[PDB]
Design a protein around this ligand. Sequence first.
Ligand SMILES: *[C@@H]1O[C@H](CO)[C@@H](O[C@@H]2O[C@H](CO)[C@@H](O[C@@H]3O[C@H](CO[C@H]4O[C@H](CO)[C@@H](O)[C@H](O)[C@@H]4O)[C@@H](O)[C@H](O[C@H]4O[C@H](CO)[C@@H](O)[C@H](O)[C@@H]4O)[C@@H]3O)[C@H](O)[C@H]2NC(C)=O)[C@H](O)[C@H]1NC(C)=O
Ligand SMILES: *[C@@H]1O[C@H](CO)[C@@H](O[C@@H]2O[C@H](CO)[C@@H](O[C@@H]3O[C@H](CO[C@H]4O[C@H](CO)[C@@H](O)[C@H](O)[C@@H]4O)[C@@H](O)[C@H](O[C@H]4O[C@H](CO)[C@@H](O)[C@H](O)[C@@H]4O)[C@@H]3O)[C@H](O)[C@H]2NC(C)=O)[C@H](O)[C@H]1NC(C)=O
Ligand SMILES: *[C@@H]1O[C@H](CO)[C@@H](O[C@@H]2O[C@H](CO)[C@@H](O)[C@H](O)[C@H]2NC(C)=O)[C@H](O)[C@H]1NC(C)=O
Ligand SMILES: *[C@@H]1O[C@H](CO)[C@@H](O[C@@H]2O[C@H](CO)[C@@H](O)[C@H](O)[C@H]2NC(C)=O)[C@H](O)[C@H]1NC(C)=O
Ligand SMILES: *[C@@H]1O[C@H](CO)[C@@H](O[C@@H]2O[C@H](CO)[C@@H](O)[C@H](O)[C@H]2NC(C)=O)[C@H](O)[C@H]1NC(C)=O
Ligand SMILES: *[C@@H]1O[C@H](CO)[C@@H](O)[C@H](O)[C@H]1NC(C)=O
Lengths: 103, 51, 174, 174, 174
Amino acid sequence: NSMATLCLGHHAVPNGTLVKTITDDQIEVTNATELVQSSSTGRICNSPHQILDGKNCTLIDALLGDPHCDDFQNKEWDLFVERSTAYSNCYPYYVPDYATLRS
Amino acid sequence: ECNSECITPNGSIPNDKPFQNVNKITYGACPRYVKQNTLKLATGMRNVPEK
Amino acid sequence: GIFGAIAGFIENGWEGMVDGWYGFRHQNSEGTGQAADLKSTQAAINQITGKLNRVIKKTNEKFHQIEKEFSEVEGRIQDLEKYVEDTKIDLWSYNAELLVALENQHTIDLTDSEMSKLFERTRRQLRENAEDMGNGCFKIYHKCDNACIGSIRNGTYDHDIYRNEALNNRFQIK
Amino acid sequence: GIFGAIAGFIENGWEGMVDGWYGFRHQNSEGTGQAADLKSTQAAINQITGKLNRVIKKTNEKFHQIEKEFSEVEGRIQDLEKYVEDTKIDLWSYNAELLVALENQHTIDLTDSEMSKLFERTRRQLRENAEDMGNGCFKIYHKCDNACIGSIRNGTYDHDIYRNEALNNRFQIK
Amino acid sequence: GIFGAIAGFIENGWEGMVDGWYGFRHQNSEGTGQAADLKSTQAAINQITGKLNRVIKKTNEKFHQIEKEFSEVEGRIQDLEKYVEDTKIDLWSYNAELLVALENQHTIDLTDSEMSKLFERTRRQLRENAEDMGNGCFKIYHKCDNACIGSIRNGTYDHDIYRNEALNNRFQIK
Ligand SMILES: *[C@@H]1O[C@H](CO)[C@@H](O[C@@H]2O[C@H](CO)[C@@H](O[C@@H]3O[C@H](CO[C@H]4O[C@H](CO)[C@@H](O)[C@H](O)[C@@H]4O)[C@@H](O)[C@H](O[C@H]4O[C@H](CO)[C@@H](O)[C@H](O)[C@@H]4O)[C@@H]3O)[C@H](O)[C@H]2NC(C)=O)[C@H](O)[C@H]1NC(C)=O
Ligand SMILES: *[C@@H]1O[C@H](CO)[C@@H](O[C@@H]2O[C@H](CO)[C@@H](O[C@@H]3O[C@H](CO[C@H]4O[C@H](CO)[C@@H](O)[C@H](O)[C@@H]4O)[C@@H](O)[C@H](O[C@H]4O[C@H](CO)[C@@H](O)[C@H](O)[C@@H]4O)[C@@H]3O)[C@H](O)[C@H]2NC(C)=O)[C@H](O)[C@H]1NC(C)=O
Ligand SMILES: *[C@@H]1O[C@H](CO)[C@@H](O[C@@H]2O[C@H](CO)[C@@H](O)[C@H](O)[C@H]2NC(C)=O)[C@H](O)[C@H]1NC(C)=O
Ligand SMILES: *[C@@H]1O[C@H](CO)[C@@H](O[C@@H]2O[C@H](CO)[C@@H](O)[C@H](O)[C@H]2NC(C)=O)[C@H](O)[C@H]1NC(C)=O
Ligand SMILES: *[C@@H]1O[C@H](CO)[C@@H](O[C@@H]2O[C@H](CO)[C@@H](O)[C@H](O)[C@H]2NC(C)=O)[C@H](O)[C@H]1NC(C)=O
Ligand SMILES: *[C@@H]1O[C@H](CO)[C@@H](O)[C@H](O)[C@H]1NC(C)=O
């Protein structure tokens, strides 16, 4: 027949991912990547930042020297962790400007 | 015991993404807290299946 | 489609082309075949990898900030602490939302650019020896065996040695 | 014009075309006429409606925020409350300003895309039977009555049955 | 390159063309020459000057804001003052970073638009009297002296008076 034919094109995928653009709320592309970390383990990794578990002590009880917080004397942290289970067991006190001091 | 640069009240999270929806309260090398639960960034072309 | 090629004049994408993003599909006297174009494939990938790398980079460690949950009612100072944080979050959410939108539209459009860029490169390559059929395919007006097709792809196609035949085939009556 | 069609190679827009955005205007042995192309018209409209819908969506109810006007001098705590709000407003004004700019530039450019997309669709449709006159019009080298024109628009134009005539008309001397 | 012209099908930019941005370079029986195209040159410049002016405009005087460096530890009120300012700076840095990115990509792309716009303007101008060689040059199929070239640039080129010669030169055998 003294002829031939040549087609040009692009690929596709059986499945696809819907993404948002300027003009479209949903539009399908061959793939995409998720930019929002939406999930967690539920557990705090003890490295690399130095974690100090406050356990049954609050930071202020640990500061003042509440007897059940003797284990916290002269300790350091990158992050001090206060637990809801914490309590106080010493003389009744009031820290005006509590939040500032804790901070 | 594990290793993670970003800490929230909900546990540590991966900071390989740019945004996060775990908690507005964070510590360390964390993703930006946003309100969205998902943001798909297209890495391919317009997918036009055959049939 | 902005450049009007993907979902514009090309009807479908090739689900069976899994060795590249853009490519060639042909038919001649020696049968049919298909092979990817690694230039335009890699070009699209490079642009996308570039912006992907550029979006996905880390920020500064943030250390001791303000309280964002409050156990007691404090009024004015708390109102402000809440207001500041909320303001922040809305703005960052906005930026993210917009970023993705702009980026995605651009990705859609740059890949459409690469499609037409490939098509035009070929159209020029073939000079007067073939015609645009409208659907992203060319009609070749001369015998073009598998070796010939392999000179078009790979850009080693001298049109001048086929020119004579092609012109005679193009300009007849019916 | 980015795609170079509207205010680029097309001289004017058609103030008398009020049945569409893009369309055809012609002259032949049976007189002159005009009719809109609903495909490209609707395409531009869909894109714009999409982004319009996407811009114009509501936000969260906002309830008890901070005071933003003050009747007395309070110094440091007021200074901050004012500073926070002002900061916020500048950033939101910026976002708005930029949003409109980007969107508008894109709207200008996507409608220019649709113009060239239509033109190229037709240029391919007509194969070798007509020539690009430069101003957004084609010179048809064969008799093409109103019925013929109505096969070009509506994409039912088989070029092959006119090809013979057109080639003879295209390749003469003067 | 998005429009695929600069660093796409044009191999190099002309370091010796210092009288414009876009232009023409030619060879004929009377030798070689070069001259700039002031239309497309000025068009690119106008767009860029416009956005440049638009980016570079001043803001409001800002007067008595908050303290941003502190000589003493104050805790909660200072924590907030620091937090507000830091938040602000991150957001403004972001906006700036993004602005430049978008603008630069657009500038790259609009100048590529102007290149192809010029090329297409010429391709249409020349009708059937010349062929696209692929590298941003045209092959003229008729004698075209310096005066002739000076009618192509300057858009006073009537193709019809050369058409006859050109067709005969285009459609021979070898
Ligand atoms: C469709 O969309 C998907 C979504 O994932 C894309 O998938 C991604 O593809 C890229 C490219 O291959 C993957 O990137 C790879 O990540 C590996 C994991 O390394 C991580 O390790 C630690 C984990 O703590 C991090 O700190 C670190 O920064 C990395 O995040 C890397 O190992 C890879 O690099 C090297 O790995 C091999 C290992 O032998 C080396 O030999 C190579 O030289 C290579 O350079 C690589 O960077 C990415 O992980 C994929 N996503 C996911 C979720 O896994 C698709 O690419 C896209 N398209 C297709 C067709 O799927
Ligand atoms: C942080 O604070 C929490 C809460 O106060 C402490 O948890 C309690 O710790 C005490 C002291 O170690 C535990 O007391 C032990 O209780 C066992 C069960 O008895 C009662 O336990 C709970 C709490 O009262 C009741 O709800 C339950 O119904 C039982 O009636 C006893 O078996 C233990 O007896 C012996 O324990 C050891 C020897 O093994 C010695 O101390 C004595 O010989 C003692 O006789 C003891 O009485 C209590 O059980 C803990 N609570 C719970 C729910 O288990 C944490 O210890 C404290 N510190 C941290 C977490 O580091
Ligand atoms: C196309 O050009 C490339 C130049 O790299 C050639 O690629 C070779 O292809 C043959 C198969 O035909 C392989 O055996 C070689 O290993 C390839 N070489 C490289 C460096 O990739 C190819 O030969 C050219 N096309 C034709 C039809 O010969
Ligand atoms: C173009 O294609 C459309 C297919 O829908 C045809 O549209 C019809 O146009 C005629 C007028 O010529 C109307 O009477 C019909 O009601 C239209 N039908 C529909 C479904 O819209 C049209 O006939 C085609 N063009 C020509 C020249 O026949
Ligand atoms: C191109 O058109 C312009 C119209 O302005 C002409 O420009 C003149 O060029 C000549 C040199 O050939 C100068 O002497 C004149 O001063 C120019 N006039 C202006 C107003 O710029 C030019 O003549 C046209 N091209 C040719 C080949 O004649
Ligand atoms: C399947 O779709 C997912 C998105 O849900 C995508 O990440 C993946 O690349 C797709 N894989 C295939 C083989 O289509």
